[PDB]
């Protein structure tokens, strides 16, 4: 507590900065007040990073290739440019899928144009056309190609749109140009927006004239679940048990036919608002499909979500929903009984990308844990609007936190556990604070749904109460 203490800590941390950097970073740090629902008056977000300060943010290409397009399993995604970007992002994100890799699925492969100096000087459109021909020869079962632009593509004036149009017409193949150059925007977020625009323009409407798909009043699509560790599958099983038919699943374990079939569903279930709100709103305007946010993190949120979703359909679905809730009640109750005593009272700080820093809070509170601090790399002010009412009074909020800032905040607050990405993990493990990866689930998971909750609870216990953390001080020191 002590809102005044936290505000003082913010000031003391800020003192080291030069004047311009300090003035900028002051707007991105705030003390929470749940009654304050207009976060713009409190915290600022979605602004450029301060140079030289060791931000955690990625780039548009990561938000588009790494996040939205890459998981689409039956397409081939071309990293267009020099070799680095596709290599660092190859299989780094655990967007799980079922397929025969290299034959009919291509998620964990790295297709690139591997730009050389001559490609920079003389342009790369002809190399791109030849590359597309080679892709068609060597991977005949691919069901479409996307071109993910890296920084030099935008800088050298290459026209990948015309190449994509011409080659797609020539080969009767869907070729999606994506101008996701890493210098655009300020983070992965504009990458999300650019990728959603590419989906809308080149894939989503291919079956607008096709009326051969049989539809039912229980057709839904899962939008913005990337199936990290199987999260989307663990959620889909609950939805299907409730009597719904999940036609499409964006984009984890996703296929291009599923995207094309999405305009035929009755309701869009949005898990990650931040990344897929653009296409969800577009679909509402163009096709009249309503959409709603849901949360399958922990039993309380998933029960509330299942009931709210079932309320959008008739009474039979609602009965099935109550049956699903009753069937799973002993499982999560046993999990709570086993692991809440081991975690009751422990305090957690989080720093993740754009959705999870607020979505996992209910799961933490279901094990009797408190989130004393949370923040985002690239969230927008509507995200903080949603975040403030779910966080406790006088808790710390940080937008686009610098490495130094987060280290100092942790040194003062001293949480029992930190959840963040790979670039912070070993920093705080060396400080003797338990750390869970909240992007990749530390190569564990799934965490969504009732089955995911047990894994979440076991993981938090095994890390928080691990004996290693009691051994950092040498007995002779």
């Amino acid at each position: 507590m002590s809102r005044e203490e936290v505000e003082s800590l913010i000031q003391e941390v800020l003192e080291v900065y030069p004047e311009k950097a300090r003035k900028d970073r002051n707007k991105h740090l705030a003390v929470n007040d749940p009654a304050v629902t207009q976060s713009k008056k409190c915290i600022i977000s979605n602004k450029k990073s301060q140079p030289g300060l060791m931000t955690i943010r990625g780039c548009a290409y990561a938000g588009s290739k790494g996040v939205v397009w890459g998981p689409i399993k039956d397409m081939i995604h071309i990293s267009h440019g020099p070799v680095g970007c596709g290599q660092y992002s190859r299989a780094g994100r655990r967007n799980y899928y079922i397929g025969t890799t290299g034959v009919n699925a291509f998620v964990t492969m790295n297709f690139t144009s591997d730009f050389q100096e001559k490609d920079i000087v003389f342009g790369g459109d002809k190399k791109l056309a030849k590359l597309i021909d080679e892709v068609e020869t060597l991977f005949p079962l691919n069901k479409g190609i996307s071109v993910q632009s890296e920084c030099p593509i935008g800088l050298i004036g290459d026209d990948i749109e015309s190449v994509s149009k011409v080659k797609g017409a020539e080969l009767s193949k869907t070729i999606v140009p994506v101008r996701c150059e890493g210098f655009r925007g300020v983070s992965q977020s504009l990458g999300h927006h650019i990728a959603n625009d590419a989906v809308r323009d080149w894939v989503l409407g291919k079956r607008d004239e096709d009326t051969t798909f049989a539809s039912t009043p229980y057709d839904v699509a899962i939008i913005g679940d990337y199936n990290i560790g199987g999260d989307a599958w663990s959620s889909r099983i609950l939805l299907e048990e409730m009597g719904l038919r999940c036609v499409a699943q964006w984009s984890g374990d996703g296929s291009i036919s599923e995207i094309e079939l999405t305009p035929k569903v009755k309701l869009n279930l949005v898990h990650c608002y931040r990344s897929m709100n653009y296409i969800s709103r577009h679909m509402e305007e163009k096709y009249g499909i309503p959409w709603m946010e849901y949360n399958f993190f922990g039993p309380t949120k998933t029960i509330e979500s299942l009931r709210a979703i079932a309320a959008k359909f008739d009474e039979s679905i609602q009965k099935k929903c109550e049956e699903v809730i009753a069937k799973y009640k002993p499982e999560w109750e046993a999990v709570v009984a086993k692991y809440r005593p081991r975690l009751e009272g422990k305090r957690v700080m989080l720093y993740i990308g754009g959705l999870r820093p607020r979505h996992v809070i209910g799961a933490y509170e279901d094990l009797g844990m408190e989130v004393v601090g949370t923040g985002y790399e690239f969230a927008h002010n509507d995200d903080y609007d949603r975040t403030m009412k779910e966080m406790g009074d006088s808790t710390l909020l940080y937008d686009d936190v610098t490495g130094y800032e987060f280290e100092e905040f942790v040194k003062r607050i001293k949480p029992d556990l930190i959840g963040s990405g790979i670039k912070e993990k070993f920093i705080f493990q060396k400080m003797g604070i338990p750390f869970r990866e909240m992007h990749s689930w530390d190569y564990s998971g799934p965490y969504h749904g009732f089955d995911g909750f047990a894994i979440f609870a076991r993981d938090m216990d095994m890390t928080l109460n691990n004996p290693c953390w009691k051994k950092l001080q040498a007995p002779w020191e």
Partner: protein, 522 residues
Amino acid sequence: SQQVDKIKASYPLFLDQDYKDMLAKKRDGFEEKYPQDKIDEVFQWTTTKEYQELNFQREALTVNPAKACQPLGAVLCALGFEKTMPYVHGSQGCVAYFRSYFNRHFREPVSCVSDSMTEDAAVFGGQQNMKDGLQNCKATYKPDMIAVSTTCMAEVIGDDLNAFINNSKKEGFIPDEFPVPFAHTPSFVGSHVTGWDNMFEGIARYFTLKSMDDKVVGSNKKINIVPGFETYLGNFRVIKRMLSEMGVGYSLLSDPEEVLDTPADGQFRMYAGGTTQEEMKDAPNALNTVLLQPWHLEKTKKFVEGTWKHEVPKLNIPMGLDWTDEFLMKVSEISGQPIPASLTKERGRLVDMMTDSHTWLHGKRFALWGDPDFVMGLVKFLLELGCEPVHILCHNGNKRWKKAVDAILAASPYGKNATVYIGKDLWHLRSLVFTDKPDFMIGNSYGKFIQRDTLHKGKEFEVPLIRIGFPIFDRHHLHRSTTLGYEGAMQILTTLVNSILERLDEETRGMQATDYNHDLVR
């Protein structure tokens, strides 16, 4: 469902019948998947010689490359200097990627900053980004030095690093005395090793070019050691230990071993160890400079010979028996220090292990890939073991390196079935290990997908992966290993022979079928 007493993660949770049925329903209803017979036929075709011929005709498409971009090497080089912050002039996404890549390989924090150039800098350059970023970095992380490299954004727009840094100094953003070496590291040229070379040459030039007047070769009685792009801490350690045993004064230039191996004792040390600025300033006074990985230290060699006037010895990477011998003998000749009895005994112990394991090693066929110096050292050691390199791949190799490796191969009968490939990627290598199957692969973690594919063809076609190189993401703490010197040769020999024996044990485990050969003693 879950059982509270035996909780299942994704594997094997998704093998449960309800999940299997749900996934089958998803596939049948909405994925429009190719029939399984077509998938099998296309896979079988991808394993063929005709497919390999198509695959090796590629001119524009690269699939699964075995290299990275220059600034990653530049960052690794910068990390080897005391209290030095790697600073990448350009886009921040590159730095996020470099940090994650090195985090996953080393399982340690990696410090690096960007000046976060955006489209505005695409129109008007990144001079302001440089000024503000240098000021912010120095104020916040308090480095003794900032080493500046570049992303491809900055290279394409032609940002003059020298002018930008000089203007930052004159306009008071950073003190004029504060060392800010820089290097252009264009990612569309060469690879990560080239970036290491460029960064090191930049630092050496910054510290020595303008003060050569009072420099006297040999006056400090040391030998300079330049390790190049090195991701095994044991390699730095073994070079230091071997030089210390000989009583040879030395200066390891770009030593990142401390900052990549800090203890977990309750505090975060952003900096530790590293080459000091005084060492870099005094380097021209050394007897000579030895380059441990010459095939990507060419620009550094040009600077060291042209400016420091050091007669850089023509030495291979100290890998295996013969090249370790030659390195030690050259160091002895340069320093006048005899080779001590401890190193002689260690060499004899390696020879003893070779004689103990030769019967299992002989004739084994290997496919291998990696950086040029590492690849050629591994090839030389494999020829010394009586093993047969068959597919030698170096995505970032060149014609001269390939000719040198061919000359190495021709010197031994064990090199007769070997072919060296440059500019080829791991999809090419996948085809090679299908159509001319070796016994094993030696490479980085990206080879696990090739092992997966070969197993999919059948257990008799599977090629197991032996993880040596960079990056290694799916095993823990292998970055602590050694590959240089007699100690590294010993570690590699042990790894190889025990991989062979482990495979043999696996193949002979079947009771009453193949376990007649499941010997207790090997």
